[PDB]
Design an enzyme around this catalytic site. Structure first.
Site, PDB file in Angstrom:
ATOM      1  N   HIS A  75       0.807  -1.225   0.000  1.00 52.06           N
ATOM      2  CA  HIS A  75       0.000   0.000   0.000  1.00 52.06           C
ATOM      3  C   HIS A  75       0.844   1.280   0.000  1.00 52.06           C
ATOM      4  O   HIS A  75       0.321   2.369  -0.313  1.00 52.06           O
ATOM      5  CB  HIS A  75      -1.026  -0.067   1.146  1.00 52.06           C
ATOM      6  CG  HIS A  75      -0.521   0.306   2.514  1.00 52.06           C
ATOM      7  ND1 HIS A  75      -0.262  -0.640   3.487  1.00 52.06           N
ATOM      8  CD2 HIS A  75      -0.275   1.506   3.079  1.00 52.06           C
ATOM      9  CE1 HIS A  75       0.129  -0.031   4.593  1.00 52.06           C
ATOM     10  NE2 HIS A  75       0.130   1.276   4.373  1.00 52.06           N
ATOM     11  N   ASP A  99      -0.093  -7.669   1.466  1.00 52.12           N
ATOM     12  CA  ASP A  99       0.304  -6.260   1.500  1.00 52.12           C
ATOM     13  C   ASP A  99       1.823  -6.118   1.580  1.00 52.12           C
ATOM     14  O   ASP A  99       2.333  -5.264   2.314  1.00 52.12           O
ATOM     15  CB  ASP A  99      -0.383  -5.504   2.659  1.00 52.12           C
ATOM     16  CG  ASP A  99      -0.241  -4.007   2.551  1.00 52.12           C
ATOM     17  OD1 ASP A  99      -0.349  -3.298   3.580  1.00 52.12           O
ATOM     18  OD2 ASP A  99       0.011  -3.497   1.446  1.00 52.12           O
ATOM     19  N   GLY A 155       2.901   6.686   8.753  1.00 52.39           N
ATOM     20  CA  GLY A 155       4.188   6.735   8.100  1.00 52.39           C
ATOM     21  C   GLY A 155       5.152   5.681   8.563  1.00 52.39           C
ATOM     22  O   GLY A 155       6.319   5.701   8.153  1.00 52.39           O
ATOM     23  N   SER A 157       4.345   2.203   8.481  1.00 53.77           N
ATOM     24  CA  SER A 157       4.168   0.922   7.805  1.00 53.77           C
ATOM     25  C   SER A 157       5.476   0.541   7.120  1.00 53.77           C
ATOM     26  O   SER A 157       6.232   1.387   6.638  1.00 53.77           O
ATOM     27  CB  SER A 157       3.027   0.921   6.787  1.00 53.77           C
ATOM     28  OG  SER A 157       3.299   1.744   5.698  1.00 53.77           O
TER      29      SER A 157
HETATM   30  C1  LIG Z   1      -4.265  -3.104  -3.659  1.00 52.51           C
HETATM   31  O1  LIG Z   1      -3.374  -3.346  -2.582  1.00 52.51           O
HETATM   32  C2  LIG Z   1      -3.656  -2.622  -1.422  1.00 52.51           C
HETATM   33  C3  LIG Z   1      -4.106  -1.165  -1.483  1.00 52.51           C
HETATM   34  C4  LIG Z   1      -4.416  -0.392  -0.207  1.00 52.51           C
HETATM   35  C5  LIG Z   1      -4.274  -1.101   1.154  1.00 52.51           C
HETATM   36  N1  LIG Z   1      -4.587  -0.367   2.365  1.00 52.51           N
HETATM   37  C6  LIG Z   1      -4.453  -1.068   3.587  1.00 52.51           C
HETATM   38  O2  LIG Z   1      -4.723  -0.430   4.797  1.00 52.51           O
HETATM   39  C7  LIG Z   1      -4.721   0.917   4.729  1.00 52.51           C
HETATM   40  C8  LIG Z   1      -3.305   1.526   4.929  1.00 52.51           C
HETATM   41  C9  LIG Z   1      -3.015   1.138   6.139  1.00 52.51           C
HETATM   42  C10 LIG Z   1      -2.176   2.151   7.007  1.00 52.51           C
HETATM   43  O3  LIG Z   1      -2.439   3.275   7.287  1.00 52.51           O
HETATM   44  N2  LIG Z   1      -0.919   1.612   7.499  1.00 52.51           N
HETATM   45  C11 LIG Z   1      -0.093   2.328   8.422  1.00 52.51           C
HETATM   46  C12 LIG Z   1       0.816   3.421   7.883  1.00 52.51           C
HETATM   47  O4  LIG Z   1       1.564   4.044   8.541  1.00 52.51           O
HETATM   48  N3  LIG Z   1       0.671   3.581   6.478  1.00 52.51           N
HETATM   49  S1  LIG Z   1       1.567   4.778   5.844  1.00 52.51           S
HETATM   50  O5  LIG Z   1       3.031   4.532   5.939  1.00 52.51           O
HETATM   51  O6  LIG Z   1       1.180   6.099   6.450  1.00 52.51           O
HETATM   52  C13 LIG Z   1       1.091   4.893   4.142  1.00 52.51           C
HETATM   53  C14 LIG Z   1      -0.413   5.092   3.921  1.00 52.51           C
HETATM   54  C15 LIG Z   1       1.933   4.090   3.162  1.00 52.51           C
HETATM   55  C16 LIG Z   1       2.126   5.607   3.276  1.00 52.51           C
HETATM   56  C17 LIG Z   1       0.549   1.673   9.611  1.00 52.51           C
HETATM   57  C18 LIG Z   1      -0.618   2.633   9.833  1.00 52.51           C
HETATM   58  C19 LIG Z   1      -0.451   3.885  10.697  1.00 52.51           C
HETATM   59  C20 LIG Z   1      -1.455   4.670  11.103  1.00 52.51           C
HETATM   60  C21 LIG Z   1      -2.947   4.331  10.860  1.00 52.51           C
HETATM   61  C22 LIG Z   1      -3.651   5.474  10.129  1.00 52.51           C
HETATM   62  C23 LIG Z   1      -5.177   5.209   9.979  1.00 52.51           C
HETATM   63  C24 LIG Z   1      -5.458   4.022   9.008  1.00 52.51           C
HETATM   64  C25 LIG Z   1      -5.848   2.778   9.852  1.00 52.51           C
HETATM   65  C26 LIG Z   1      -5.963   1.534   8.974  1.00 52.51           C
HETATM   66  N4  LIG Z   1      -6.312   0.396   9.734  1.00 52.51           N
HETATM   67  C27 LIG Z   1      -6.863  -0.782   9.092  1.00 52.51           C
HETATM   68  O7  LIG Z   1      -7.139  -0.895   7.929  1.00 52.51           O
HETATM   69  O8  LIG Z   1      -6.972  -1.796  10.081  1.00 52.51           O
HETATM   70  C28 LIG Z   1      -7.533  -3.045   9.713  1.00 52.51           C
HETATM   71  C29 LIG Z   1      -7.519  -3.872  11.025  1.00 52.51           C
HETATM   72  C30 LIG Z   1      -6.758  -3.750   8.580  1.00 52.51           C
HETATM   73  C31 LIG Z   1      -8.984  -2.796   9.249  1.00 52.51           C
HETATM   74  C32 LIG Z   1      -4.580   1.263   8.393  1.00 52.51           C
HETATM   75  O9  LIG Z   1      -3.633   1.078   9.106  1.00 52.51           O
HETATM   76  N5  LIG Z   1      -4.437   1.270   6.922  1.00 52.51           N
HETATM   77  C33 LIG Z   1      -5.397   1.462   6.004  1.00 52.51           C
HETATM   78  C34 LIG Z   1      -3.976  -2.495   3.668  1.00 52.51           C
HETATM   79  C35 LIG Z   1      -3.823  -3.150   5.010  1.00 52.51           C
HETATM   80  F1  LIG Z   1      -4.968  -3.100   5.709  1.00 52.51           F
HETATM   81  F2  LIG Z   1      -3.427  -4.414   4.773  1.00 52.51           F
HETATM   82  F3  LIG Z   1      -2.870  -2.496   5.717  1.00 52.51           F
HETATM   83  N6  LIG Z   1      -3.685  -3.235   2.478  1.00 52.51           N
HETATM   84  C36 LIG Z   1      -3.857  -2.528   1.213  1.00 52.51           C
HETATM   85  C37 LIG Z   1      -3.512  -3.299  -0.074  1.00 52.51           C
END
Ligand SMILES: COc1ccc2nc(O[C@@H]3C[C@H]4C(=O)N[C@]5(C(=O)NS(=O)(=O)C6(C)CC6)C[C@H]5/C=C\CCCCC[C@H](NC(=O)OC(C)(C)C)C(=O)N4C3)c(C(F)(F)F)nc2c1
Ligand SMILES: [Zn+2]
Length: 197
Positions: A75, A99, A155, A157
């Site tokens: 992601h 992911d 930020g 992940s």
């Molecule tokens: C086509 O392929 C795909 C396309 C899109 C996808 N989008 C996915 O999830 C999205 C991104 C991920 C995220 O924000 N990650 C972190 C981060 O820091 N990202 S990041 O670096 O800022 C960045 C965005 C990269 C720059 C660690 C988090 C920190 C803070 C939380 C913020 C609030 C968001 C809370 C949410 N919670 C959630 O969904 O919890 C449950 C339990 C899963 C429902 C959450 O965490 N996210 C939502 C996933 C996943 F879900 F597998 F991760 N797969 C995908 C596969």
């Protein structure tokens, strides 16, 4: 077709220094140079350490070297190449279902070793070099001993969860948020990476 654009490379812009008694973030490239390096894919900077801070044109997150592969989240990176001294490097692993993506670890990086301890007392490393205790709660989940607003985890992940001995246990994927407070995190277990390998 003539004007169809190419997405840039992921670029290493810093690292989380864990080599001493104090964990701290280091920036190694500013925003302008990051943009230039994303377009060329040519990054001549020397790489060090296990946890890299990485960026695209639109997002910043972390990547972690484990057993000679630099791993991060799909992601954040999508199918992007990563910039290197010799030009763009194609992903060697891509798994949207997990992911997860990986590239060959950059020359000069250091790799973490996959944990075999079977321990549930973990430590999450964030992009601000916070080391957050996390109790393992399942194959892919752990609870924060001290919950924090999601702002503090955004930020991070692609960063590692480590065991007490500093082995890699997993890759941070998602935050479990209630009303903006992260009480738990979801991660890609290292065993999933080892199978991919
Ligand atoms: C086509 O392929 C795909 C396309 C899109 C996808 N989008 C996915 O999830 C999205 C991104 C991920 C995220 O924000 N990650 C972190 C981060 O820091 N990202 S990041 O670096 O800022 C960045 C965005 C990269 C720059 C660690 C988090 C920190 C803070 C939380 C913020 C609030 C968001 C809370 C949410 N919670 C959630 O969904 O919890 C449950 C339990 C899963 C429902 C959450 O965490 N996210 C939502 C996933 C996943 F879900 F597998 F991760 N797969 C995908 C596969
Ligand atoms: Zn261990």
């Amino acid at each position: 077709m003539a004007s169809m654009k190419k997405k840039g490379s992921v670029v290493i812009v810093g690292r989380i220094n864990l080599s001493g008694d104090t964990a701290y973030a280091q920036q190694t490239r500013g925003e302008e140079g990051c943009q230039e390096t994303s377009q060329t894919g040519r990054d001549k900077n020397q790489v060090e350490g296990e946890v890299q801070i990485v960026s695209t044109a639109t997002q910043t997150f972390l990547a972690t070297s484990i057993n000679g592969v630099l791993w991060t989240v799909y992601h954040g990176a999508g199918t992007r190449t990563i910039a290197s001294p010799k030009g763009p490097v194609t992903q060697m692993y891509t798994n949207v279902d997990k992911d997860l993506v990986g590239w060959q670890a950059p020359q000069g990086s250091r790799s973490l070793t996959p944990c075999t301890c079977g321990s549930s007392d973990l430590y999450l490393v964030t992009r601000h070099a916070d080391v957050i205790p996390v109790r393992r709660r399942g194959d892919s989940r752990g609870s924060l001993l001290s919950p924090r607003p999601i702002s503090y985890l955004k930020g991070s992940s692609g960063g590692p969860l480590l065991c007490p001995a500093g082995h890699a246990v997993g890759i941070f994927r998602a935050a479990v948020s209630t009303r903006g407070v992260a009480k738990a995190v979801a991660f890609i277990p290292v065993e999933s990476l080892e199978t991919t390998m």
